[PDB]
Structure 1
C-alpha cells in the first residue's frame, strides 16, 4: 500500500480527518486526498473530470455526514471505515498479482469503483467516470474521453 506519492496522500487524508476531529477516515476523504495525488489527478484529468466541482462535492459531503468526536474522548484519532480498508486491500492485491511492486493513486482510484454504496463511487459516476475509463488510461496509453 506504499508508493511515497500514495503514502503522502494517505497522510494528508488522515491529517485532514484529525483536523476536523472526524470520527472516521472515509473513502471520500481518500478520494478527496487523491485529487492532489499526481497519479490519480492525471487519470481524472484524462477523463475530463471537473476537479474543482468534485473537490467541492467531496468536502461538502464529508463535513455534513462525518461524525465528529466529543472533543474530549481519549484520542482514538480517526477509525478507517471498512470500505476504506477494502479499497486499499483491493489496490494492493491488484498490484501484487500483476507482478509489480508499487501501488499508485490511480490503482487506488480504480479500487474505489468496486465500493458500491460509497458516496465517492457515486460522485465519480456522476462526473461520467467509470472503472473502464480509468483502467483504459492506466494501460495502453492516454485513452482519454476528451
Structure 2
C-alpha cells in the first residue's frame, strides 16, 4: 500500500501525461513528478541536488522522446513503460520486507536507481547522486 503523498504524486504525473496526451508514462515522468514529493525531494535536497536543473533536463527529455497519441482516436490510455512497472514494484516489494505498511516517495526514488538504462537514472547519476546516498539518507539522515 502506498502513502497518501506518493499516490498523489502518481495521480499527479499521470494526469499530466493525459493532458499532454503522452502514449507512455515513463520513469522520467516519475522521477520528475517525484521532484515535488515531500519524502523524495528531502532526500534529494539532502544530496545537494539542483532541483531546478533536474526538472528542466527531465521535462526536456520527456518531451523530445515521448511518443504522443494521434489526435484521432481516444481508445488508448497512458501505458506505463515496463521500466516504470518495475521500479514501482521493486519499491513495493522492499517496503514489504521491512514490515512498515506504507511505501514512501524516497522508497521509489531508491528504486529508480536500479533501472540502469533509464535516463532518470543517468540524470540522477550525472547530478552526483548515488543509490547509497539516497539510501543512507533514508536509513539515518547524516
Partner of 1:26: 26
1:98-138 CA deviation, whole Å, 9 max, x = no partner? 11111000000000000000000000000000000000000
Give the length in aligned residue pairs. Answer: 142
1:48-96 CA deviation, whole Å, 9 max, x = no partner? 0001000000000001000000012234220000000000000000000
RMSD after superposition: 0.8
Q: Provide the C-alpha distance between the structure 1 equivalents of 2:17 and 2:110, rounded to a whole number of angstroms.
A: 22
The question of 1:89 aligning with 2:89 is answered yes
Q: Provide the C-alpha distance between the structure 2 equivalents of 1:50 and 1:82, rounded to a whole number of angstroms.
A: 28
3-state SS in 1 of match to 2:11: helix
Q: Once superposed, which parts of structure 1, at least 4 consecutive aligned residues long, lie more than 4 Å away?
A: none
3-state SS in 2 of match to 1:98: coil
The question of 1:130 aligning with 2:120 is answered no
Q: Provide the C-alpha distance between the structure 2 equivalents of 1:28 and 1:42, rounded to a whole number of angstroms.
A: 18
Q: Provide the C-alpha distance between the structure 1 equivalents of 2:111 and 2:132, rounded to a whole number of angstroms.
A: 11
3-state SS in 1 of match to 2:96: helix
Give the drift of 1:141: 2.1
TM-score, structure 2 normalization: 0.97
TM-score, structure 1 normalization: 0.95
Which has the larger displacement, 29-38 or 71-80? Answer: 71-80
